[PDB]
Amino acid sequence: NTPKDQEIKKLVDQNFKPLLEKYDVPGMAVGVIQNNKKYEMYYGLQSVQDKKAVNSSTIFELGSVSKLFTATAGGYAKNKGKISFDDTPGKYWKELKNTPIDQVNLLQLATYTSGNLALQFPDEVKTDQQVLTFFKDWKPKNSIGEYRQYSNPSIGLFGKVVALSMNKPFDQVLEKTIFPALGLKHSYVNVPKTQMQNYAFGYNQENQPIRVNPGPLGAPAYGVKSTLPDMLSFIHANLNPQKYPADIQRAINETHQGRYQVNTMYQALGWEEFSYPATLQTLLDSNSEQIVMKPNKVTAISKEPSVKMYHKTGNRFGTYVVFIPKENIGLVMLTNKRIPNEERIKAAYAVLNAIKK
């Protein structure tokens, strides 16, 4: 292969490969896209029990990186006039009309500022019916819009609303509208029978294979599955939205707009945004316990940074994606085992700082 193929292989071998042994991770796929050329590295096993090696067809669970697709769907719906971000959920989910949650707008749900939604639903909320009841019974706490608390229920409700506004279930929004618009071929909410042989098992902390369908409203928060080639295409779309038809181009661009600031992090739709270059500490701070687990006061912005970069981490979901528009480069890491977020961020930082222009 080319000098570039070899260079990138060396950097990934040096920075990502050692994580497999360190965290006993069965399988990993790492991809780089630079100047619209894709570079794919595969390690280890898609399935331990089957001795099936990870390859370009291997479908991984994206975990929280799923939220980037929910964000894109929301951007799509907004730019087709199907929703306004100033709307409230009861406009679409009619059973929520004239309940307190109908005082929170869609942008606030998408960006985690309702003021009273935690990382997960309560343990007892297990079914679709129960999720609706939960939202009807909800009451505010922190001033709406003022505090960010990273939240699966919050973006789940956003996703449900987006689906309602497009008159189809969320899985169909992604599988029939958004994935095809992005040119993705093996990305799914529900992996079909024909692709099960390619679907990596996830592995818990005891090295046992786990496979569940998402909980109620779970799909918009953590329910997407994809391959490394598809994820590199998704990064390409984020790096070059102008090359795509207007409806999806406008959707992608919508996800890049910072909506508020928490210290050095700007919250966009799905994506976290930073002034570029971001220090390693800035990137690490974005995924600290303080930021991920606790409420933090937001500050309004009048402007985004002049030069930007974006990332998202995907807890058995070892996923990470990052891109830098100015350098026309991005990186994707997929694994089927938990790896601390800080290790993902550090490895990607080393690679992106070292790759030749």
CA distance 41 to 63: 20
Q: How many CB atoms within 10 Å of residue 221?
A: 26
After which residues does the chain have a break in its backbone, defined as C to next N over 2.5 Å?
314
CA 295 to centroid of chain Cα atoms:
20
β-bridge partners, 27: 44
Cβ(331)–Cβ(31) under 8 Å?
yes
Measured at the CA of 230, the angle between CA 228 and CA 231, to 5 degrees, comes to 65
What Å distances lie between residue 182 and 64, 111, 232, 295, 303, CA to CA? Answer: 19, 23, 11, 33, 28
CA distance 236 to 184: 11
Structure token digits, residue 197: 């042989």
Cβ(298)–Cβ(261) under 8 Å?
yes
What Å distances lie between residue 57 and 40, 184, 231, 337, CA to CA? Answer: 12, 12, 12, 18
Structure token digits, residue 317: 């979901």
Structure token digits, residue 344: 């993902």
Residues 6+ apart with CB under 8 A from 72: 178, 182, 248, 251, 252, 255, 269, 270
What Å distances lie between residue 333 and 30, 31, 151, 281, 338, CA to CA? Answer: 5, 7, 23, 20, 12
Structure token digits, residue 79: 């730019």
Residue 345, amino acid: I
The phi, psi pair for 26, rounded to 5°, reads -65, -45
The phi, psi pair for 203, rounded to 5°, reads -130, 125
The label of the residue with tokens 């786990």 reads 210
The catalytic residue among 64, 114, 226, 286 is: 64
Task: Identify the CA nearest to 299 among candidates 257, 256, 262.
Answer: 262
CA distance 272 to 264: 10
CA distance 23 to 19: 6
Structure token digits, residue 14: 């040096």
Q: Radius of gyration over alpha carbons of the chain, in Å?
A: 19
Residues 6+ apart with CB under 8 A from 88: 102, 103, 104, 105, 106
Q: Are strands 52-53 and 209-210 parallel, antiparallel or unpaired?
A: unpaired
What Å distances lie between residue 280 and 289, 304, 349, 354, CA to CA? Answer: 16, 20, 7, 14
Task: Identify the CA nearest to 270 among candidates 288, 257, 279.
Answer: 257
CA distance 272 to 280: 14
The count of C-alpha atoms lying within 13 angstroms of the C-alpha of 227, restricted to the half-sphere facing its C-beta, is 20
Task: Identify the CA nearest to 265 among candidates 308, 220, 323, 222.
Answer: 308
Residues 6+ apart with CB under 8 A from 227: 29, 56, 57, 58, 59, 60, 186, 187, 198
What Å distances lie between residue 25 and 28, 131, 203, 295, CA to CA? Answer: 8, 34, 8, 32
CA distance 175 to 357: 36
CA 153 to centroid of chain Cα atoms:
15
Measured at the CA of 256, the angle between CA 254 and CA 260, to 5 degrees, comes to 100
Experimental method: X-ray
Residue 245, amino acid: P
Residue 288 bears catalytic tag: no
Residues 6+ apart with CB under 8 A from 254: 74, 75, 78, 79, 269
Structural domains in the chain, sorted by start = 1-357 (3.40.710.10)
CA distance 197 to 43: 17
Cβ(83)–Cβ(266) under 8 Å?
no
- CA dihedral for 166, 170, 175, 179, sign (positive or negative): positive
End-to-end Cα distance, the chain: 18
Residue 104, amino acid: V
24: left (phi over 0), alpha (psi -120 to 50) or beta: left
CA distance 239 to 233: 10
3-class secondary structure per residue, the chain: CCHHHHHHHHHHHHHCCHHHHHCCCCEEEEEEEECCEEEEEEEEEEECCCCEECCCCCEEECHHHHHHHHHHHHHHHHHCCCCCCCCCHHHCCHHHCCCHHHHCCHHHHHCCCCCCCCCCCCCCCCCHHHHHHHHHHCCCCCCCCCEECCCHHHHHHHHHHHHHHCCCCHHHHHHHHHHHHCCCCCCECCCCHHHHHHECCEECCCCCEECCCCCCCCHHHHCCEECHHHHHHHHHHHHCHHHCCHHHHHHHHHHCCCCEEECCEEECCCCEEEECCCCHHHHHHHCCHHHHHCCEECECCCCCCCCEEEEEECCCCCEEEEEEHHHCEEEEEEECECCCHHHHHHHHHHHHHHCCC
